[PDB]
């Protein structure tokens, strides 16, 4: 009848300016009517509550840029509660600096002139121009029944070029920050090379 010890199982920042964490209802216990996320930051005694339970969706806390600092630990807890009782997640120690994983890149186009010409864009709402964010890219591609993919690292460039038969290629691009996590591959683009 009472919950259900919860877990904050991941946090992620897509751009060092905001971030979001996520929790799972607990290892068997009752149906939690309510959830609560509280935290403090180092260099501060003051106890906070989640600023925003909506935008991240189901079982999530979203920290807008107004509540997001780089280089400062966040000590976090979720409370799960019933008419019957309650339980507290373990404290989670988390630092925005080390949970950066951007969205995938946008508008992957492929043109076919002796070479093919791949072009993409940053995920939106990264701030690249200013120096704040630094985004490395990577490209994979494969004929249609190939066992293994071919990966070409492309650094900070938003374009790249390969030298190949008369064949159909699936191509994908992903991106990571200078230090952090690879985005997921973007959706595939398709290109036929003539003779």
């Amino acid at each position: 009848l009472p919950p259900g010890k919860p877990e904050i199982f991941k946090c992620r920042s897509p751009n060092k300016e905001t971030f979001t964490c996520w929790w799972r209802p607990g290892t068997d216990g009752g149906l939690p009517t309510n959830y609560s996320l509280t935290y403090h930051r180092e260099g501060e005694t003051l106890m906070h509550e989640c600023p925003d339970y909506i935008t991240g969706g189901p079982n999530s806390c979203h920290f807008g840029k107004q509540y997001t600092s780089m280089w400062r630990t966040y000590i976090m807890m979720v409370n799960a509660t019933n008419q019957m009782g309650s339980s507290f997640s373990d404290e989670l120690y988390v630092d925005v600096t080390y949970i950066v994983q951007p969205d995938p890149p946008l508008e992957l186009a492929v043109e076919v002139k002796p070479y093919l010409w791949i072009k993409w864009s940053p995920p939106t709402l990264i701030d690249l121009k200013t120096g704040w964010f630094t985004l490395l890219y990577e490209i994979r591609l494969k004929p249609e029944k190939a066992a293994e993919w071919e990966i070409h690292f492309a650094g900070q460039q938003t374009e790249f070029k390969i030298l190949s038969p008369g064949q159909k290629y699936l191509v994908q691009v992903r991106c990571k920050p200078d230090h952090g996590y690879w985005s997921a591959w973007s959706p595939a683009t398709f290109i036929q090379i003539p003779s």
């Binding site: 180092e42 840029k65 600092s69 780089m70 280089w71 000590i75 200013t130 120096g131 704040w132 230090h179």
Partner: protein, 165 residues
């Protein structure tokens, strides 16, 4: 000599420094995060924590900071090595590079007062528990500050030698 050439060099160094301190901290792990809270000698400083505060802070100020932060770390870096003798290997590497970076850094400033570190006793500690807390705090703090400098440099470069493009 050129404000360019130098910046390019700095970032190259900063990025490389942040990497080594990551991996060193990383393998060093092998619940101490709990005592690392508020443990860094640079906490005292007024560093920007946002894109929005980094932008609001000008070239001059921003660069003094960088040099303070770097000046601050040769002390602990040096005793970190001193005391210590791959975990040894990387430290001797970080000491050098930070030295080259502060050099390049001091160049930049001519063309365009820092916090003391006193956790030495704490590294030479009788009890293994405390010893490891102090080493963990050191490393976690260096990883943090390497990251911050790198990011701050990457920023000013864009600001000044690329007018934010």
């Amino acid at each position: 000599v050129t404000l360019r050439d130098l910046f390019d060099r700095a970032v190259v160094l900063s990025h490389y420094i942040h990497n080594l301190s990551s991996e060193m901290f990383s393998e060093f792990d092998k619940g101490f995060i709990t005592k690392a809270i508020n443990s860094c000698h640079t906490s005292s400083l007024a560093t920007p924590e946002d894109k929005e505060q980094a932008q609001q802070m000008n070239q001059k100020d921003f660069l003094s900071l960088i040099v303070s932060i770097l000046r601050s770390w040769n002390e602990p870096l040096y005793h970190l090595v001193t005391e210590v003798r791959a975990i040894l290997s990387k430290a001797v590497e970080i000491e050098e590079q930070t030295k080259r970076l502060l050099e390049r850094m001091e160049l930049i400033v001519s063309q365009v007062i820092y916090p003391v570190w006193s956790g030495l006793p704490s590294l030479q500690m009788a009890d293994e528990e405390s010893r490891l807390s102090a080493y963990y705090n050191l490393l976690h703090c260096l990883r943090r500050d390497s990251h911050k400098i790198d990011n701050y440099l990457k920023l000013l470069k864009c600001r000044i030698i690329h007018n934010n493009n």
